Every structure is written in C-alpha cells, then in structure tokens.
Amino acid sequence: PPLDLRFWAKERGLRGKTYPLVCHSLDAAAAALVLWNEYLSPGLRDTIASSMETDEEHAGHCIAFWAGLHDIGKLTREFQQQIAIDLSAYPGEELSGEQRSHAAATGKWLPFALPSLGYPNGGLVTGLVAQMLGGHHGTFHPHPSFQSRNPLAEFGFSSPHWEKQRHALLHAVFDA
DNA sequence: CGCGGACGAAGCCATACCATGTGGGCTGTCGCCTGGA
Ligand SMILES: [Fe+3]
C-alpha cells in the first residue's frame, strides 16, 4: 500500500503547517543511531548489549527501529482529527471517546501487529518492548489484557484501511 | 466518709469546548288535545 503523507506528527507552533508522521519516525530513529554511536559510552553499550544477548550491530539496529516506532500510535482518528484534516478517504473507526493518548495507542497496538515480523506471539520480548516504547511520555502502561480472541478489534482497531496504513508505516520504517 | 456523674485519654486524616420533544371522558327531552285504533 502506498504510504500517505497527510498524517501529522507535530503541530504545535508550526504557523499553520503540518509535519508528516513518517519523517518524524525516521529522523527519530536516526537520532537513536547517532546517539548510540556518538553519545552513549562503549561500556554501557556492552552492558545493554550483553543483557539482551545481542551485539552492538543488531542491538543498535533494533533500538533504532524501536525509536522509529515510538509515535506510531498517532495513527488513530482522535489524534489527527484534532484539527481540520480530511478523513472521508477511509471510513470506519468512529469516535468512541476513550481519551487514549498516542503513547497508549502504540503501547496497546504493537503487541499484536509486529508478530508478522518475527517476534513470538504472546512472548515476553514483544511485551517489554511494546510497553517500553508505548510509555514514551514518562508514564508506563500495563501489559495488554484482552478477553476476546480478536484483540486488534477489541481495542478499537477495526477498520482494515487504517490497519493497512499502519502496517505500511511499520514495514516502511522496518526496511528503512 | 462514701460516692454520682461526667469527662477525657487517642487512634484517626489523604514534556513533545456542545443537549432534549408531550398531552384526551361526561350528560340528559317533550306540545297538547281529540280521534281512532
Ligand atoms: Fe511522542
């Protein structure tokens, strides 16, 4: 699916301009890498890399992709509808009023989409990383507790259009 | 001297703006008189 550039990532004090979400995800991941090489100490990187059974190369790669996903939860409807943006393109997912923050949205959606990329479904690694970046605003949220065998739809993610776009963004930052 | 009644001693407290649609049940009338049935 062709990725769209209408979705926002930053709106405060832009004098009427909108910033694409994908560019924020990517430049964020880049910040993760450059800080992973220039800022962090080699010994601490030995600590983290050792604790995660991986090496600097793939550990840095992983956390870079994770930073690139920090704000993926912004692809809801209450998030972009905050200002006048045309949403009639993709129907469904009407306003329920859960007041979820984008960080909560990502923290609750990641444990069920990324398994197509290889993380073990229901495992621990995907959980810790999911809540880990999902709490990117200082407050961590609990692990997803669902009672329906279709968790994606019970959390309010039922439109195949929206899900197809966020999967597209996921894959985009994944090969990037 | 023996004692009633009343109080007081604490353990407690609590950084990345908007809405509401409803109802139904009670009252009595004449023209009067003759004729025919
Ligand atoms: Fe964020």
Short mmCIF file of N, CA, C and O in Angstrom, two decimals, chain A residues 24 30 65-66 93 132 144 161-162:
data_model
loop_
_atom_site.label_atom_id
_atom_site.label_comp_id
_atom_site.label_asym_id
_atom_site.label_seq_id
_atom_site.Cartn_x
_atom_site.Cartn_y
_atom_site.Cartn_z
N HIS A 24 8.95 12.11 10.99
CA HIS A 24 9.27 12.16 12.41
C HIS A 24 9.76 10.80 12.91
O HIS A 24 10.71 10.72 13.69
N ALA A 30 16.97 7.92 13.37
CA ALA A 30 18.32 8.39 13.10
C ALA A 30 18.94 8.95 14.36
O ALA A 30 20.10 8.67 14.67
N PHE A 65 15.04 0.96 15.31
CA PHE A 65 13.71 0.71 14.77
C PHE A 65 12.64 0.98 15.81
O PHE A 65 11.58 1.56 15.50
N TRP A 66 12.96 0.68 17.07
CA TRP A 66 12.03 0.92 18.16
C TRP A 66 11.78 2.41 18.32
O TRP A 66 10.63 2.85 18.45
N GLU A 93 -13.95 3.17 12.19
CA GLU A 93 -13.30 3.60 13.42
C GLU A 93 -13.83 4.95 13.89
O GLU A 93 -13.13 5.96 13.91
N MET A 132 7.43 -0.69 26.64
CA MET A 132 8.62 0.14 26.74
C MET A 132 8.52 1.38 25.87
O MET A 132 8.65 2.51 26.37
N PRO A 144 -1.08 -5.52 27.71
CA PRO A 144 -2.43 -5.67 27.15
C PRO A 144 -3.14 -6.89 27.70
O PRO A 144 -2.69 -8.03 27.53
N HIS A 161 -8.68 -0.35 6.55
CA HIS A 161 -7.95 0.73 5.90
C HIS A 161 -6.85 1.24 6.81
O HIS A 161 -5.65 1.18 6.49
N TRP A 162 -7.25 1.73 7.99
CA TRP A 162 -6.31 2.24 8.98
C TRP A 162 -5.23 1.22 9.31
O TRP A 162 -4.03 1.53 9.29
#
